[PDB]
Amino acid sequence: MAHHHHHHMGTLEAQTQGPGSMDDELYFVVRNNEGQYSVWMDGRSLPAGWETVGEPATKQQCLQRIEQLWTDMVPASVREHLNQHSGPGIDYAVR
Protein backbone atom coordinates (compact mmCIF):
# COMPACT_ATOMS: atom_id res chain seq x y z
CA MET A 1 0.00 0.00 0.00
CA ALA A 2 2.55 2.56 1.21
CA HIS A 3 4.99 4.14 -1.26
CA HIS A 4 8.22 4.54 0.72
CA HIS A 5 10.51 2.32 -1.33
CA HIS A 6 12.79 1.18 1.54
CA HIS A 7 12.76 1.67 5.32
CA HIS A 8 15.74 3.58 6.72
CA MET A 9 17.33 0.80 8.79
CA GLY A 10 18.71 1.45 12.26
CA THR A 11 22.40 0.96 13.00
CA LEU A 12 22.66 -2.11 15.25
CA GLU A 13 19.12 -3.25 16.05
CA ALA A 14 16.05 -2.29 14.00
CA GLN A 15 13.25 -4.79 13.37
CA THR A 16 11.49 -3.99 10.09
CA GLN A 17 9.05 -6.91 10.33
CA GLY A 18 8.75 -8.34 13.83
CA PRO A 19 10.19 -11.02 16.19
CA GLY A 20 8.79 -13.97 14.24
CA SER A 21 5.72 -16.19 14.47
CA MET A 22 5.54 -17.85 17.92
CA ASP A 23 8.87 -19.62 17.80
CA ASP A 24 12.28 -19.72 19.47
CA GLU A 25 14.09 -19.82 16.12
CA LEU A 26 16.12 -16.71 16.93
CA TYR A 27 19.06 -15.91 14.69
CA PHE A 28 21.78 -13.28 14.80
CA VAL A 29 23.73 -11.74 11.96
CA VAL A 30 27.39 -12.78 12.14
CA ARG A 31 30.72 -12.28 10.38
CA ASN A 32 34.50 -12.18 10.84
CA ASN A 33 37.61 -10.92 8.98
CA GLU A 34 35.44 -10.86 5.80
CA GLY A 35 33.43 -7.64 6.13
CA GLN A 36 30.46 -9.32 4.44
CA TYR A 37 27.40 -10.57 6.33
CA SER A 38 26.01 -13.96 7.25
CA VAL A 39 23.44 -15.35 9.71
CA TRP A 40 23.75 -17.75 12.65
CA MET A 41 21.34 -19.47 15.06
CA ASP A 42 21.27 -17.73 18.45
CA GLY A 43 22.16 -19.81 21.51
CA ARG A 44 24.88 -21.59 19.55
CA SER A 45 28.38 -20.51 20.62
CA LEU A 46 30.49 -18.94 17.88
CA PRO A 47 34.11 -19.88 17.07
CA ALA A 48 36.67 -17.44 18.50
CA GLY A 49 36.94 -14.55 16.05
CA TRP A 50 33.29 -14.40 14.95
CA GLU A 51 31.13 -11.37 15.77
CA THR A 52 27.36 -10.86 16.09
CA VAL A 53 25.01 -8.05 14.92
CA GLY A 54 21.33 -7.16 14.48
CA GLU A 55 18.37 -8.26 16.58
CA PRO A 56 18.00 -11.92 17.62
CA ALA A 57 14.99 -12.94 15.53
CA THR A 58 13.75 -15.49 12.99
CA LYS A 59 15.91 -16.28 9.93
CA GLN A 60 13.48 -14.17 7.88
CA GLN A 61 14.23 -11.07 9.96
CA CYS A 62 17.93 -11.82 10.12
CA LEU A 63 18.39 -12.15 6.34
CA GLN A 64 15.82 -9.45 5.51
CA ARG A 65 17.83 -6.99 7.58
CA ILE A 66 21.19 -7.47 5.85
CA GLU A 67 19.66 -7.98 2.39
CA GLN A 68 17.93 -4.61 2.82
CA LEU A 69 21.27 -3.13 3.95
CA TRP A 70 24.05 -4.16 1.57
CA THR A 71 22.30 -6.07 -1.21
CA ASP A 72 19.24 -3.77 -0.99
CA MET A 73 19.95 -1.96 -4.28
CA VAL A 74 17.69 -4.18 -6.38
CA PRO A 75 17.28 -3.75 -10.21
CA ALA A 76 14.15 -4.44 -12.33
CA SER A 77 13.97 -7.83 -10.58
CA VAL A 78 11.91 -6.05 -7.90
CA ARG A 79 9.18 -5.21 -10.43
CA GLU A 80 8.90 -8.91 -11.24
CA HIS A 81 7.73 -9.70 -7.69
CA LEU A 82 6.21 -6.30 -6.91
CA ASN A 83 2.58 -7.19 -6.14
CA GLN A 84 0.94 -3.84 -5.36
CA HIS A 85 2.37 -2.00 -8.38
CA SER A 86 0.63 1.17 -7.15
CA GLY A 87 2.44 1.09 -3.80
CA PRO A 88 4.82 -1.66 -2.54
CA GLY A 89 4.78 -0.69 1.13
CA ILE A 90 7.16 -3.51 1.96
CA ASP A 91 9.50 -3.59 -1.05
CA TYR A 92 11.00 -6.96 -1.94
CA ALA A 93 14.74 -7.08 -1.25
CA VAL A 94 17.14 -9.24 -3.26
CA ARG A 95 19.13 -11.76 -1.22
mmCIF file of all heavy atoms in Angstrom, residues 15-49:
data_model
loop_
_atom_site.group_PDB
_atom_site.id
_atom_site.type_symbol
_atom_site.label_atom_id
_atom_site.label_comp_id
_atom_site.label_asym_id
_atom_site.label_seq_id
_atom_site.Cartn_x
_atom_site.Cartn_y
_atom_site.Cartn_z
ATOM 1 N N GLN A 15 14.156 -3.805 13.944
ATOM 2 C CA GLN A 15 13.250 -4.795 13.371
ATOM 3 C C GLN A 15 12.283 -4.137 12.392
ATOM 4 O O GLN A 15 11.452 -3.317 12.787
ATOM 5 C CB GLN A 15 12.467 -5.506 14.483
ATOM 6 C CG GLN A 15 13.355 -6.204 15.503
ATOM 7 C CD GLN A 15 12.566 -6.911 16.591
ATOM 8 O OE1 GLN A 15 12.248 -6.326 17.626
ATOM 9 N NE2 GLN A 15 12.240 -8.173 16.366
ATOM 10 N N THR A 16 12.399 -4.490 11.117
ATOM 11 C CA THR A 16 11.488 -3.993 10.088
ATOM 12 C C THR A 16 10.570 -5.131 9.626
ATOM 13 O O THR A 16 10.436 -5.408 8.433
ATOM 14 C CB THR A 16 12.276 -3.397 8.891
ATOM 15 O OG1 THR A 16 13.225 -2.428 9.368
ATOM 16 C CG2 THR A 16 11.348 -2.719 7.885
ATOM 17 N N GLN A 17 9.947 -5.793 10.598
ATOM 18 C CA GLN A 17 9.050 -6.912 10.329
ATOM 19 C C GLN A 17 8.400 -7.371 11.631
ATOM 20 O O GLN A 17 7.186 -7.257 11.809
ATOM 21 C CB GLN A 17 9.819 -8.078 9.683
ATOM 22 C CG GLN A 17 8.926 -9.190 9.141
ATOM 23 C CD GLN A 17 7.998 -8.711 8.035
ATOM 24 O OE1 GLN A 17 6.864 -8.296 8.292
ATOM 25 N NE2 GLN A 17 8.476 -8.745 6.800
ATOM 26 N N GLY A 18 9.230 -7.872 12.543
ATOM 27 C CA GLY A 18 8.754 -8.345 13.832
ATOM 28 C C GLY A 18 9.721 -9.338 14.447
ATOM 29 O O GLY A 18 10.815 -9.527 13.921
ATOM 30 N N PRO A 19 9.359 -9.978 15.575
ATOM 31 C CA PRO A 19 10.194 -11.021 16.186
ATOM 32 C C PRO A 19 10.176 -12.318 15.366
ATOM 33 O O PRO A 19 11.224 -12.895 15.054
ATOM 34 C CB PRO A 19 9.551 -11.228 17.567
ATOM 35 C CG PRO A 19 8.127 -10.811 17.394
ATOM 36 C CD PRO A 19 8.130 -9.715 16.358
ATOM 37 N N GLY A 20 8.973 -12.753 15.007
ATOM 38 C CA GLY A 20 8.794 -13.969 14.239
ATOM 39 C C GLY A 20 7.338 -14.385 14.222
ATOM 40 O O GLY A 20 6.452 -13.540 14.060
ATOM 41 N N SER A 21 7.085 -15.675 14.395
ATOM 42 C CA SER A 21 5.724 -16.186 14.469
ATOM 43 C C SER A 21 5.325 -16.388 15.935
ATOM 44 O O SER A 21 4.649 -15.544 16.527
ATOM 45 C CB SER A 21 5.617 -17.499 13.682
ATOM 46 O OG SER A 21 6.043 -17.324 12.339
ATOM 47 N N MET A 22 5.790 -17.492 16.516
ATOM 48 C CA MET A 22 5.536 -17.845 17.921
ATOM 49 C C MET A 22 6.638 -18.797 18.371
ATOM 50 O O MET A 22 6.458 -19.617 19.271
ATOM 51 C CB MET A 22 4.158 -18.528 18.088
ATOM 52 C CG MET A 22 2.958 -17.604 17.907
ATOM 53 S SD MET A 22 1.382 -18.473 18.060
ATOM 54 C CE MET A 22 0.223 -17.124 17.848
ATOM 55 N N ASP A 23 7.793 -18.638 17.744
ATOM 56 C CA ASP A 23 8.868 -19.621 17.796
ATOM 57 C C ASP A 23 10.082 -19.106 18.567
ATOM 58 O O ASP A 23 10.158 -17.929 18.931
ATOM 59 C CB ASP A 23 9.278 -19.972 16.361
ATOM 60 C CG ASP A 23 9.624 -18.729 15.552
ATOM 61 O OD1 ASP A 23 8.684 -18.031 15.095
ATOM 62 O OD2 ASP A 23 10.824 -18.432 15.396
ATOM 63 N N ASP A 24 11.019 -20.018 18.813
ATOM 64 C CA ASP A 24 12.278 -19.718 19.472
ATOM 65 C C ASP A 24 13.430 -19.777 18.473
ATOM 66 O O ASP A 24 14.597 -19.892 18.862
ATOM 67 C CB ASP A 24 12.518 -20.739 20.586
ATOM 68 C CG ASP A 24 11.786 -20.404 21.871
ATOM 69 O OD1 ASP A 24 10.604 -20.781 22.008
ATOM 70 O OD2 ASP A 24 12.395 -19.769 22.758
ATOM 71 N N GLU A 25 13.103 -19.686 17.188
ATOM 72 C CA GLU A 25 14.090 -19.824 16.119
ATOM 73 C C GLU A 25 14.843 -18.512 15.913
ATOM 74 O O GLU A 25 14.927 -18.001 14.796
ATOM 75 C CB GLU A 25 13.395 -20.247 14.814
ATOM 76 C CG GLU A 25 12.514 -21.485 14.953
ATOM 77 C CD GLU A 25 13.295 -22.743 15.297
ATOM 78 O OE1 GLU A 25 13.518 -23.009 16.502
ATOM 79 O OE2 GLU A 25 13.675 -23.485 14.364
ATOM 80 N N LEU A 26 15.394 -17.972 16.998
ATOM 81 C CA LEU A 26 16.123 -16.714 16.934
ATOM 82 C C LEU A 26 17.487 -16.899 16.279
ATOM 83 O O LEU A 26 18.210 -17.864 16.545
ATOM 84 C CB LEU A 26 16.285 -16.080 18.325
ATOM 85 C CG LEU A 26 15.029 -15.388 18.888
ATOM 86 C CD1 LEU A 26 13.941 -16.399 19.240
ATOM 87 C CD2 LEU A 26 15.383 -14.527 20.095
ATOM 88 N N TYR A 27 17.807 -15.957 15.414
ATOM 89 C CA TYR A 27 19.065 -15.911 14.692
ATOM 90 C C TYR A 27 19.703 -14.545 14.883
ATOM 91 O O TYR A 27 19.003 -13.547 15.090
ATOM 92 C CB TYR A 27 18.839 -16.152 13.188
ATOM 93 C CG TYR A 27 18.648 -17.607 12.791
ATOM 94 C CD1 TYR A 27 17.594 -18.361 13.293
ATOM 95 C CD2 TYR A 27 19.524 -18.217 11.900
ATOM 96 C CE1 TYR A 27 17.419 -19.682 12.921
ATOM 97 C CE2 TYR A 27 19.357 -19.533 11.524
ATOM 98 C CZ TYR A 27 18.304 -20.264 12.036
ATOM 99 O OH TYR A 27 18.135 -21.581 11.656
ATOM 100 N N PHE A 28 21.024 -14.517 14.826
ATOM 101 C CA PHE A 28 21.783 -13.277 14.797
ATOM 102 C C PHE A 28 22.532 -13.177 13.485
ATOM 103 O O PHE A 28 22.794 -14.186 12.828
ATOM 104 C CB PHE A 28 22.786 -13.201 15.964
ATOM 105 C CG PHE A 28 22.353 -12.289 17.081
ATOM 106 C CD1 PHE A 28 22.358 -12.723 18.390
ATOM 107 C CD2 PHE A 28 21.932 -11.000 16.813
ATOM 108 C CE1 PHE A 28 21.954 -11.886 19.417
ATOM 109 C CE2 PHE A 28 21.532 -10.169 17.833
ATOM 110 C CZ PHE A 28 21.545 -10.611 19.134
ATOM 111 N N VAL A 29 22.882 -11.960 13.112
ATOM 112 C CA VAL A 29 23.730 -11.739 11.959
ATOM 113 C C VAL A 29 25.171 -11.851 12.434
ATOM 114 O O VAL A 29 25.504 -11.333 13.495
ATOM 115 C CB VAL A 29 23.477 -10.348 11.329
ATOM 116 C CG1 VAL A 29 24.457 -10.066 10.197
ATOM 117 C CG2 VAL A 29 22.033 -10.222 10.842
ATOM 118 N N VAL A 30 26.016 -12.560 11.699
ATOM 119 C CA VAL A 30 27.389 -12.784 12.137
ATOM 120 C C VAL A 30 28.371 -12.609 10.993
ATOM 121 O O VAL A 30 27.995 -12.673 9.816
ATOM 122 C CB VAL A 30 27.577 -14.198 12.745
ATOM 123 C CG1 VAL A 30 26.648 -14.405 13.938
ATOM 124 C CG2 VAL A 30 27.361 -15.278 11.687
ATOM 125 N N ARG A 31 29.627 -12.368 11.357
ATOM 126 C CA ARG A 31 30.716 -12.285 10.380
ATOM 127 C C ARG A 31 32.069 -12.267 11.086
ATOM 128 O O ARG A 31 32.127 -12.166 12.312
ATOM 129 C CB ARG A 31 30.576 -11.029 9.501
ATOM 130 C CG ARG A 31 30.797 -9.721 10.252
ATOM 131 C CD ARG A 31 30.783 -8.517 9.316
ATOM 132 N NE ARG A 31 31.149 -7.281 10.012
ATOM 133 C CZ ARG A 31 31.167 -6.071 9.447
ATOM 134 N NH1 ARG A 31 30.853 -5.922 8.164
ATOM 135 N NH2 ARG A 31 31.507 -5.007 10.163
ATOM 136 N N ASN A 32 33.149 -12.396 10.314
ATOM 137 C CA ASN A 32 34.499 -12.181 10.843
ATOM 138 C C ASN A 32 35.517 -12.043 9.711
ATOM 139 O O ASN A 32 35.443 -12.758 8.714
ATOM 140 C CB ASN A 32 34.923 -13.339 11.768
ATOM 141 C CG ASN A 32 35.129 -14.674 11.047
ATOM 142 O OD1 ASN A 32 36.016 -15.450 11.407
ATOM 143 N ND2 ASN A 32 34.308 -14.963 10.045
ATOM 144 N N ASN A 33 36.468 -11.116 9.892
ATOM 145 C CA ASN A 33 37.615 -10.917 8.977
ATOM 146 C C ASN A 33 37.216 -10.820 7.484
ATOM 147 O O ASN A 33 38.082 -10.725 6.612
ATOM 148 C CB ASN A 33 38.640 -12.047 9.192
ATOM 149 C CG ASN A 33 39.971 -11.788 8.497
ATOM 150 O OD1 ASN A 33 40.860 -11.143 9.052
ATOM 151 N ND2 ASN A 33 40.124 -12.306 7.289
ATOM 152 N N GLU A 34 35.921 -10.816 7.186
ATOM 153 C CA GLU A 34 35.439 -10.855 5.802
ATOM 154 C C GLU A 34 34.763 -9.542 5.408
ATOM 155 O O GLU A 34 34.808 -9.131 4.247
ATOM 156 C CB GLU A 34 34.471 -12.036 5.638
ATOM 157 C CG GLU A 34 33.252 -11.973 6.559
ATOM 158 C CD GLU A 34 32.551 -13.316 6.704
ATOM 159 O OE1 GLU A 34 32.073 -13.861 5.683
ATOM 160 O OE2 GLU A 34 32.482 -13.834 7.840
ATOM 161 N N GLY A 35 34.130 -8.892 6.377
ATOM 162 C CA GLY A 35 33.434 -7.636 6.130
ATOM 163 C C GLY A 35 32.033 -7.833 5.569
ATOM 164 O O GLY A 35 31.171 -6.965 5.727
ATOM 165 N N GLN A 36 31.787 -8.984 4.949
ATOM 166 C CA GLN A 36 30.458 -9.319 4.437
ATOM 167 C C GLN A 36 29.607 -9.908 5.558
ATOM 168 O O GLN A 36 30.104 -10.127 6.664
ATOM 169 C CB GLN A 36 30.552 -10.291 3.257
ATOM 170 C CG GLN A 36 31.197 -11.623 3.610
ATOM 171 C CD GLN A 36 31.287 -12.568 2.426
ATOM 172 O OE1 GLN A 36 31.399 -12.135 1.279
ATOM 173 N NE2 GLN A 36 31.245 -13.863 2.692
ATOM 174 N N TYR A 37 28.331 -10.153 5.286
ATOM 175 C CA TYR A 37 27.397 -10.566 6.330
ATOM 176 C C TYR A 37 26.861 -11.972 6.122
ATOM 177 O O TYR A 37 26.620 -12.404 4.992
ATOM 178 C CB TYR A 37 26.234 -9.575 6.416
ATOM 179 C CG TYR A 37 26.604 -8.317 7.161
ATOM 180 C CD1 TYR A 37 26.663 -7.079 6.531
ATOM 181 C CD2 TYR A 37 26.915 -8.387 8.508
ATOM 182 C CE1 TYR A 37 27.024 -5.944 7.231
ATOM 183 C CE2 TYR A 37 27.275 -7.257 9.218
ATOM 184 C CZ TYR A 37 27.327 -6.037 8.574
ATOM 185 O OH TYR A 37 27.687 -4.906 9.274
ATOM 186 N N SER A 38 26.685 -12.677 7.237
ATOM 187 C CA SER A 38 26.011 -13.963 7.249
ATOM 188 C C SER A 38 25.056 -14.033 8.439
ATOM 189 O O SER A 38 24.943 -13.073 9.199
ATOM 190 C CB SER A 38 27.036 -15.104 7.301
ATOM 191 O OG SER A 38 27.877 -15.085 6.157
ATOM 192 N N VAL A 39 24.360 -15.159 8.591
ATOM 193 C CA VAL A 39 23.443 -15.352 9.713
ATOM 194 C C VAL A 39 23.779 -16.633 10.473
ATOM 195 O O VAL A 39 24.376 -17.560 9.918
ATOM 196 C CB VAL A 39 21.962 -15.377 9.254
ATOM 197 C CG1 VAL A 39 21.566 -14.013 8.682
ATOM 198 C CG2 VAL A 39 21.715 -16.491 8.234
ATOM 199 N N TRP A 40 23.394 -16.667 11.743
ATOM 200 C CA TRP A 40 23.748 -17.754 12.650
ATOM 201 C C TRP A 40 22.628 -17.946 13.670
ATOM 202 O O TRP A 40 21.945 -16.985 14.025
ATOM 203 C CB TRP A 40 25.063 -17.394 13.347
ATOM 204 C CG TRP A 40 25.646 -18.463 14.222
ATOM 205 C CD1 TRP A 40 25.433 -18.636 15.561
ATOM 206 C CD2 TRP A 40 26.571 -19.485 13.827
ATOM 207 N NE1 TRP A 40 26.166 -19.700 16.020
ATOM 208 C CE2 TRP A 40 26.871 -20.240 14.976
ATOM 209 C CE3 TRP A 40 27.171 -19.835 12.613
ATOM 210 C CZ2 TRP A 40 27.748 -21.321 14.948
ATOM 211 C CZ3 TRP A 40 28.040 -20.910 12.586
ATOM 212 C CH2 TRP A 40 28.321 -21.642 13.747
ATOM 213 N N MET A 41 22.434 -19.175 14.136
ATOM 214 C CA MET A 41 21.344 -19.472 15.063
ATOM 215 C C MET A 41 21.746 -19.100 16.489
ATOM 216 O O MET A 41 22.740 -19.607 17.015
ATOM 217 C CB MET A 41 20.962 -20.955 14.983
ATOM 218 C CG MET A 41 19.675 -21.305 15.724
ATOM 219 S SD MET A 41 19.213 -23.038 15.525
ATOM 220 C CE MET A 41 17.594 -23.056 16.293
ATOM 221 N N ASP A 42 20.970 -18.213 17.106
ATOM 222 C CA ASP A 42 21.268 -17.727 18.454
ATOM 223 C C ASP A 42 21.228 -18.868 19.469
ATOM 224 O O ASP A 42 20.474 -19.834 19.306
ATOM 225 C CB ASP A 42 20.282 -16.626 18.859
ATOM 226 C CG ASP A 42 20.506 -16.131 20.281
ATOM 227 O OD1 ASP A 42 21.547 -15.491 20.541
ATOM 228 O OD2 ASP A 42 19.643 -16.380 21.149
ATOM 229 N N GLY A 43 22.047 -18.754 20.511
ATOM 230 C CA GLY A 43 22.158 -19.807 21.508
ATOM 231 C C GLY A 43 23.328 -20.729 21.224
ATOM 232 O O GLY A 43 23.845 -21.393 22.124
ATOM 233 N N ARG A 44 23.749 -20.767 19.964
ATOM 234 C CA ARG A 44 24.877 -21.593 19.551
ATOM 235 C C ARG A 44 26.170 -20.775 19.599
ATOM 236 O O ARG A 44 26.298 -19.770 18.898
ATOM 237 C CB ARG A 44 24.639 -22.144 18.138
ATOM 238 C CG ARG A 44 25.740 -23.078 17.643
ATOM 239 C CD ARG A 44 25.453 -23.595 16.241
ATOM 240 N NE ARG A 44 26.557 -24.410 15.730
ATOM 241 C CZ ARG A 44 26.747 -24.704 14.444
ATOM 242 N NH1 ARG A 44 25.908 -24.251 13.517
ATOM 243 N NH2 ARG A 44 27.789 -25.443 14.087
ATOM 244 N N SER A 45 27.113 -21.212 20.430
ATOM 245 C CA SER A 45 28.379 -20.509 20.623
ATOM 246 C C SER A 45 29.164 -20.404 19.313
ATOM 247 O O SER A 45 29.246 -21.366 18.541
ATOM 248 C CB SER A 45 29.213 -21.226 21.692
ATOM 249 O OG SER A 45 28.506 -21.311 22.921
ATOM 250 N N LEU A 46 29.733 -19.226 19.082
ATOM 251 C CA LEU A 46 30.488 -18.937 17.878
ATOM 252 C C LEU A 46 31.974 -19.201 18.092
ATOM 253 O O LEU A 46 32.501 -18.958 19.181
ATOM 254 C CB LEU A 46 30.278 -17.472 17.477
ATOM 255 C CG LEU A 46 29.030 -17.192 16.632
ATOM 256 C CD1 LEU A 46 28.758 -15.696 16.554
ATOM 257 C CD2 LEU A 46 29.198 -17.771 15.229
ATOM 258 N N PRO A 47 32.653 -19.730 17.064
ATOM 259 C CA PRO A 47 34.112 -19.877 17.065
ATOM 260 C C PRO A 47 34.814 -18.549 17.359
ATOM 261 O O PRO A 47 34.390 -17.484 16.877
ATOM 262 C CB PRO A 47 34.436 -20.348 15.640
ATOM 263 C CG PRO A 47 33.174 -20.965 15.136
ATOM 264 C CD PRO A 47 32.043 -20.248 15.830
ATOM 265 N N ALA A 48 35.883 -18.619 18.146
ATOM 266 C CA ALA A 48 36.667 -17.442 18.497
ATOM 267 C C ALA A 48 37.041 -16.658 17.241
ATOM 268 O O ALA A 48 37.644 -17.207 16.315
ATOM 269 C CB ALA A 48 37.922 -17.852 19.263
ATOM 270 N N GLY A 49 36.695 -15.377 17.220
ATOM 271 C CA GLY A 49 36.937 -14.549 16.052
ATOM 272 C C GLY A 49 35.655 -14.044 15.416
ATOM 273 O O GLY A 49 35.644 -12.965 14.822
#
